[PDB]
Structures are given as C-alpha cells and as structure tokens.
C-alpha cells in the first residue's frame, strides 16, 4: 500500500547523514562557482530520484562581497594617526580545514564603503527601546558617533536601521559571551560554544519583502530594467562590520562617559559596559576607525525547481522549499535542512517509481541567495506570482532542521494547527525518556501552550526566511518545523554563520544518530504528504477564528493604555470585534457543511474556499510604506524582522503614540487601521459563506 506510512518508513537517518556530509565539505556562498556546481548536482540527483521535471531558474541580482586584495578591519587609532590595535582579518579555521580555500572572511553584506573615524557609543542590542533609553532617558546623542552593538534579540538589519536613524556614522556588531556562550559548555572544536575569534556573518538590508534591491515587483531576468544604486531598496547608508568577543573586549575595555543604565545592558565580558561616548581619561584622544571596502555586484544565482505532477489536481501546488547557499560550510544553516529535503524527494520518488502519484502537484525548491535577503525565493515568486496565487495550496519551509536537541518548534498559519497536532500524534518521539511515546506527547510536555492545557506551543510566522514572499506577500498558507533548545535554561545557536558551523559540529554535538533530523523529515514530509494527498484540504478555518479573537483582545488592550485619547477621538474597536464574531459564526457553519457533503464540484468549491481563505487576508494596497507586506493579520515586526506581529497595521499606528506631536492625526490613523482590519476580517469570513 502507498499511504503516508509507506512514505514515512522510506525516510532514513543514515541517508540524511550522508547528504549532510556531501553538502558541507566546501563553502557554497551565493553567486560562486561552487554553489552553481552544487545546484547542478541537486538537479541531476532529483531527476535520478524520479521527479517529472527538474529545472534551474536563474536571476541576476545584487550581491555583496569583500575585496580579496583590500581587507575589511577596524582599528583603534592614536592622536598621531597610528593604528595601535587591529581587529582580525579572518576566523582561525577549525581542525582539518586550515587549508580550505574560498572561506569568505567575516563581513556585513551590503555595507557601503568608507573609513569613518570617531568616538564609540555602546548601544546594547541596538533595539528601538535601547535607542529610546539612550536619547530620551540618558540624553546621549549618537549623531556622528560610531556605535557598537551586541548581536542578539532582533534581526541585525533592524539594528543598523535604528543606528542610522540615530545619526551614527558607522556600526560595529559583536557576539557577546552572554548571548553566544552557554555556561559549562566548551568552545568549538571541543563543544558547541562560540570561541573568542568566531564571528557571525550576515546581511544588514531592510528590504521589507522587496527581494533583489534593484528590481522590486518584477523578476531579475535577462531584460529586467534595474534601479540605479541610489534608488535601490533597503541598503544601509553607513559602514558596518562584525567582530568576535576577543576583539570586542579590546574596543570596550577603554570606554568612558556614562555607566550602563542597569544590569540588562551588561554582557559577560570583564568590562564596565560604559555607554560612552568615547574612552576614559588617559585614552580620550584615541578614536575608532573602520576600513570597509566591500563591493555590491550584480551576480547570477540559481534555484533548482523539481516537479512531481499530481494525478487528480495537477493545477494545485504544494511547495516544499529551503535554501542551499551558505555563508561558509552551512553545517546547520541550511544544509541540515537541505539534506532533509533531499531525503524527502528521494522517498516521494521511490513511491512514484512504483506507480504512485500524489493527488496534487508537489514542487520542491532549492533556493539560492537566501542569505543575501531571500533573493532566490522572492525573484522566482515574482516571476510566477499569477500561478502561485491562483494555484498555491501551501508552502512548507525547510531551512535548518536543528538548532538544539530538546524539543520540536513549529511556526505556521492557524490553518495548519490541526494538521500539525494530528500528524505529531502519529509520529514516534525521538527524545530520551519518551521511548514508545508520540512526538505530540514529548513536545506538549516540553513546550506547553501558554493558553491551553494538554496542547503544545505553536508560534506565528515572523520572517527572515524563504516563506516570506509566499505568506506575507502572496497569502499562501505557510509553515515550518525544526528541533530546538530549551529556552528556559539557555539567541539561536552559538556558532551561527561562523566558519565553525560544520558537519562535525552536527555529528559530534547536536545529533550523532541523526534521529532529530529524521523526526524533522517526518514532520515536514508528512505535512507535505497530507497537503498534497488528502481529499479535503487539511485546513481548519475554526482555528483562525480562535486566534483572531486573541489578537483582537491583544490590540484592544494596547490601545486601552490611552483611555483619555480613546474618549477624545472616539476610538472604537467595536467593528473589529464584530468582524471576528462574524468570522467565528461563518467558519463554524462552513465546517458543518464541510463535514456533511464524490460530488467533486462541491468538494473542489469547498477546497477552493479553503485554499483562498489565507489569500483573503491580503490587502492589494499593502501596509503603510511596506507595499510587499500585504497580509493584514500578520507582518514581520517593524522593530525585528524575525518576530511576527499580529494586526501589524494597528500595532504600528499605536506604537509610541504618546510621543507623536499631532495626536489628532495619529489617532485618526489608528482608527483607519481598525477599519481596514475589521473590513479584511469580514471580507475573509464572507469567502466561507455559501457561494450563491
């Protein structure tokens, strides 16, 4: 029999291990020869595995690279202009890799060039509230200063945006042991901690879903008309560079000026964490100088797109996608994900060779240039947007399979909650002490839901990964799952985007038996299997009704911190609660009809109502000043691209509203966003009413 159990049983830990090893022996940086060769290998193997077609889709997009003959570094410079301390030119390579070529040195992708010189200010995590504290409470002015910020808490592009708006002339990012060194664990190669010479690479764009900075709205194909650099989307205006904590200590140890305002500003180094500006007494004439010479370059990238044609509904697409490009070896990010995709394709192909086909078409994607701003997935979705919005059932992401070994993490649309619960009850837990128990049981025990007894936590989607275009731009139901750490006893994982993130890291310290990888392959592959084969799409609209109420209560509570203004400007949430009530009632009736109807037209009318329900939350006018974030219920937080925000239009209208100089205008915009949200909820509800 060809059923889900047949698909799941064919998946093997040993295969995933073999593929991870195969994918992580050399760097696969976006736009390089090595990553094009890997794309060709994947393409050939997916054909071998049995897919109906496997093509490369290429685009020419803006990338960023250091200059090989003019290296980036930071100095402390004395009053004579002598550089008395320099940060490192590269991370010491790990054992046995000291002769590997083409390891990109640490840099911040898309930094402009410059050599700014000035006094340091320490800005903690460079979050919106950190800058509020500096400027409003401490009266410290960042204008014309170089800021030094620790990585963690929020997406690094938001840090740079915040520094730039505070008037900084450059940004130094560093990894503090407080955030990247777990107590009692050794650093790499003897443990999974970050060594003092380790450095986190990463892009610092603020694209807001645009894709390639030069071609917002349209694929970067052969005849594309490109914006000039000065009109490009999302580039930083000040130089930026990342360093490790050995180098950070040398920059922080001399800092003077004001003391940290409280303990939440202090990391784990043996330094005062003074905010500045500048150094203490004896060193007051010394300055910090950056030397950045990286160049932005339009470069070709390649996605691999594999098709497994559906037997009954070939014009309905379930997409499993994850990226292939890495900063260096990609031991976790992304190859732990890509190896899982590879084994899933292999398993689906095994069944296909025996004569089986899924009910709906499955598309498999190996995305390029994710690390430079989700570029490969976004350009391909721009090219194919008409097909995706009329045919896209669901998108399941497949980046890093593991960031810990403690329990499952799932972030997804409410439409998938019931699917995920049901699937995990049928899978075996890989956890020690839970042998013979379900993954649902171990997950629910280790990560309880904050609101419901006997249910596990499932989070809303944020961004910072390839599902962004499908979910927040196009309104296609999306999900993701991976193994994670215990958040209570622990900021991602310490070796993230460093040369030390290797095959050996995973095989020695994360998942020696590859059983967590296998469990994640079962979850991602099982979700895809059910989405692509279930007669009735496995979405429960009633789960959306429950969360919409929770989010409406949440936004109303935020507004209710300002009761006098709500009275003065007549700010009512009545329409939003009415829409949510109507959605609840209509969804309940639709569910009854869905349970109560071989008449393939009613079924398909009803599958179309299920498929277009996520689509109904899209506003074609987009959110204010963010035209590619169109989903009215969810958008990436304007303060942290990684976090999702609910009712983002109202949330941003209320944020820091007490500091707006024209309260009538500000509260008018709150009321406008309430209207847009109530209207969109009611409109989505009405897509589930009887059609005529």
Ligand X SMILES: *[C@@H]1O[C@H](CO)[C@@H](O[C@@H]2O[C@H](CO)[C@@H](O)[C@H](O)[C@H]2NC(C)=O)[C@H](O)[C@H]1NC(C)=O
Ligand Y SMILES: *[C@@H]1O[C@H](CO)[C@@H](O[C@@H]2O[C@H](CO)[C@@H](O[C@@H]3O[C@H](CO)[C@@H](O)[C@H](O[C@H]4O[C@H](CO)[C@@H](O)[C@H](O)[C@@H]4O)[C@@H]3O)[C@H](O)[C@H]2NC(C)=O)[C@H](O)[C@H]1NC(C)=O
Annotated binding site: 156, 203, 215, 218, 323, 333, 370-371, 379, 382, 399, 463-465, 480-482, 496-497, 641-642
State which of positions 390-419 bind Cl ion (CB under 5 A): 397, 399
Helix count and strand count (H, E) for the chain: 21, 19
Give me the 26-45 binding string for ligand X, x by CB under 6 A, dash otherwise: ---------------x--xx
Q: How many of the other CB atoms lie within 10 Å of CB of 96?
A: 10
β-pair type (53-65, 170-174)? unpaired
# residues contacting ligand 2G5 (CB under 6 A): 16
Strand spans (E) along 183-227: 202-203
Check binding of 222 to ligand Y (CB under 6 A). Answer: yes
> Minimum Å distance from CB 78 to ligand X?
10
What is the phi/psi pair of residue 481, to 5°?
-150, 145
- Could you tell me the two tokens for 280? 């203490």
Q: Which stretch binds ligand Y (CB under 6 A): 116-124, 139-147, 503-511, 576-584?
A: 576-584
Is 137 an active-site residue?
no
- Could you tell me the two tokens for 605? 């009318």
State which of positions 384-403 bind ligand 2G5 (CB under 6 A): 399-400
State which of positions 467-486 bind Cl ion (CB under 5 A): 480
Known binding positions for Ca(2+):
215, 218, 379, 382
Nearest in space to 100 (alpha carbons), one of 25, 162, 161: 25
Among 575, 605, 616, 672, binds ligand Y (CB under 6 A): 575
Is 28 an active-site residue?
no
Q: Which residue, 429 or 465, has its beta carbon nearer to Zn ion?
A: 465
User: ∠200-206-209 over CA atoms, to 5°?
Assistant: 115
**CA pair distance 197, 289, nearest whole angstrom:** 20
State which of positions 271-330 bind ligand 2G5 (CB under 6 A): none
DSSP result, 368-398 = S-GGGTSHHHHHHHHHTHHHHHHHEEEEEE-
Check binding of 371 to ligand 2G5 (CB under 6 A). Answer: yes
Indicate the length of the chain as a whole number.
692
# residues contacting Cl ion (CB under 5 A): 3
**Considering CB distances under 5 to 8 angstroms, the limit depending on partner class, which of ligand X, ligand Y, its own copies, none binds residue 10?**
none
> Minimum Å distance from CB 469 to Ca ion?
10
> Minimum Å distance from CB 505 to ligand NAG?
8
Catalytic residue among 28, 631, 637, 652: 631
State which of positions 217-256 bind Ca ion (CB under 5 A): 220
Q: Which stretch binds its own copies (CB under 8 A): 255-263, 309-317, 421-429, 559-567?
A: 309-317
**Considering CB distances under 5 to 8 angstroms, the limit depending on partner class, which of ligand X, Ca ion, ligand Y, none binds residue 595?**
ligand X
> Minimum Å distance from CB 584 to ligand Y?
10
Q: Which residue, 39 or 684, has its beta carbon nearer to its own copies?
A: 684
* 3-state SS assignment for residue 562: coil
Check binding of 67 to ligand NAG (CB under 6 A). Answer: yes
Q: How far apart, in Å, are the Cα atoms of 172 and each of 248, 487, 581, 586?
A: 9, 27, 49, 52
Is 466 an active-site residue?
no
Q: How far apart, in Å, are the Cα atoms of 274 and each of 85, 134, 250?
A: 20, 12, 14
Q: Which stretch binds ligand 2G5 (CB under 6 A): 32-40, 54-62, 248-256, 371-379?
A: 371-379
Among 277, 334, 404, 462, binds Zn ion (CB under 5 A): 334
DSSP result, 89-133 = SSPPPPTT-TT-S--PPS-EETPPPB--EE-EEE-TT--HHHHHI
Q: Which stretch binds Ca ion (CB under 5 A): 172-180, 205-213, 647-655, 657-665?
A: 205-213
Cis peptide leading into residue 334 (ω within 30°): yes
> Minimum Å distance from CB 216 to its own copies?
9
Q: How far apart, in Å, are the Cα atoms of 211 and each of 127, 471, 685?
A: 24, 14, 31
**Considering CB distances under 5 to 8 angstroms, the limit depending on partner class, which of Ca ion, its own copies, ligand Y, none binds residue 212?**
Ca ion
DSSP result, 122-157 = E-TT--HHHHHIIIIIS----TTPEEEEE-BSB-HH
* 3-state SS assignment for residue 53: strand
**CA pair distance 385, 374, nearest whole angstrom:** 16
* Residues labelled as active-site residues: 370, 572, 608, 631
Interface contacts to its own copies, rule CB under 8 A: 52, 217-219, 221, 223-225, 307, 309-310, 312-315, 317, 361, 383-387, 390-391, 574-575, 600-601, 604-605, 608-609, 612, 615-616, 619-621, 627, 668, 671-672, 674-676, 678-679, 683-684, 686-687, 691-692
Interface ranges with ligand X (CB under 6 A)? 22, 25, 41, 44-45, 83-86, 418-419, 422, 538, 540, 595
């Amino acid at each position: 029999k060809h059923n889900m159990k047949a698909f799941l049983d064919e998946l093997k830990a040993e295969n995933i291990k073999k593929f991870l090893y195969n994918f992580t022996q050399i760097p696969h940086l976006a736009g390089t020869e090595q990553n094009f060769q890997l794309a060709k290998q994947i393409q050939s193997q997916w054909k071998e595995f049995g897919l109906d077609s496997v093509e490369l889709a290429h685009y020419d997009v803006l990338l960023s690279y250091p200059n090989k003959t003019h290296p980036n570094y930071i100095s402390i410079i004395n009053e004579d202009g002598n550089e008395i301390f320099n940060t490192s030119l590269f991370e010491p390579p790990p054992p046995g890799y000291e002769n590997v070529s083409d390891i990109v040195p640490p840099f911040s992708a898309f930094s402009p060039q410059g050599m700014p010189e000035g006094d340091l200010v320490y800005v903690n995590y460079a979050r919106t509230e950190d800058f509020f504290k500096l400027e409003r409470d401490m009266k410290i002015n960042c204008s014309g200063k170089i800021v030094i910020a620790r990585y963690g808490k929020v997406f690094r592009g938001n840090k740079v945006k915040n520094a730039q708006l505070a008037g900084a002339k450059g940004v130094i990012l560093y990894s503090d042991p407080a955030d990247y060194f777990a107590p009692g664990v050794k650093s790499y190669p003897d443990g999974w901690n970050l060594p003092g010479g380790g450095v986190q690479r990463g892009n610092i764009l603020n694209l807001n879903g645009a894709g390639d900075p030069l071609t917002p709205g349209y694929p970067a194909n052969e005849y594309a008309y490109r914006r000039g650099i000065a009109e490009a989307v999302g580039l930083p205006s000040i130089p930026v560079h990342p360093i490790g904590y050995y180098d950070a200590q040398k920059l922080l140890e001399k800092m003077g000026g004001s003391a940290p305002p409280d303990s939440s500003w202090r990391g784990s180094l043996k330094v005062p964490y003074n905010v500045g500006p500048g150094f203490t007494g004896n060193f007051s004439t010394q300055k910090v100088k950056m030397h950045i010479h990286s160049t932005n370059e339009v470069t070709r990238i390649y996605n691999v797109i594999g098709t497994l044609r559906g037997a009954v509904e070939p014009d309905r697409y379930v997409i499993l996608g994850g990226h292939r490009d890495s900063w260096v070896f990609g031991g976790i990010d992304p190859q732990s994900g890509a190896a899982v995709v590879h084994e899933i394709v292999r398993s689906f192909g095994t069944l296909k060779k025996e004569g089986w086909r899924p009910r709906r078409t499955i598309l498999f994607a190996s995305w390029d240039a994710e690390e430079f701003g989700l570029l490969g997935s976004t350009e391909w979705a721009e090219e194919n947007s008409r097909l995706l919005q009329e045919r896209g059932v669901a998108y399941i992401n497949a980046d890093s399979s593991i960031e810990g070994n403690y329990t499952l993490r799932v972030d997804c649309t409410p439409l998938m909650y019931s699917l995920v619960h049901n699937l995990t009850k049928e899978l075996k837990s890989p956890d020690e002490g839970f042998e013979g128990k379900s993954l649902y049981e171990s997950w629910t025990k280790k990560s309880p839901s904050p609101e419901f007894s006997g249910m596990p936590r499932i989070s809303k989607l944020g961004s910072g990964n390839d599902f962004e275009v499908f979910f927040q731009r196009l309104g296609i139901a999306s999900g993701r799952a991976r193994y994670t750490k215990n958040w209570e006893t622990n900021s991602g994982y310490p070796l993230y985007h460093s040369v030390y993130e290797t095959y050996e890291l995973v095989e020695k310290f994360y998942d020696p038996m590859f059983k967590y990888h296998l469990t994640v392959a079962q979850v991602r592959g099982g979700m895809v299997f059910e989405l692509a084969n279930s007669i009735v799409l496995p979405f429960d609209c009633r789960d959306y009704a429950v969360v919409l109420r929770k989010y409406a209560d949440k936004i109303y509570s935020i507004s209710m911190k300002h009761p006098q203004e709500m009275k003065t400007y007549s700010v009512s949430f009545d329409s939003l609660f009415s829409a949510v009530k109507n959605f609840t009632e209509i969804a309940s009736k639709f569910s009854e009809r869905l349970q109560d109807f071989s008449n393939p037209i009613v079924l398909r009318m009803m599958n179309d109502q299920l498929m277009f329900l996520e689509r109904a939350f899209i506003d074609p006018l987009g959110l204010p000043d963010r035209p590619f974030y169109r989903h009215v219920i969810y958008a990436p937080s304007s303060h942290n691209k990684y976090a999702g925000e609910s009712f983002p239009g109202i949330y941003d209208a209320l944020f820091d509203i007490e500091s707006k100089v024209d309260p009538s205008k500000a509260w008018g915009e709150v009321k406008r966003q309430i209207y847009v949200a109530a209207f969109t909820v009611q409109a989505a509800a009405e897509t589930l009413s009887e059609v005529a």
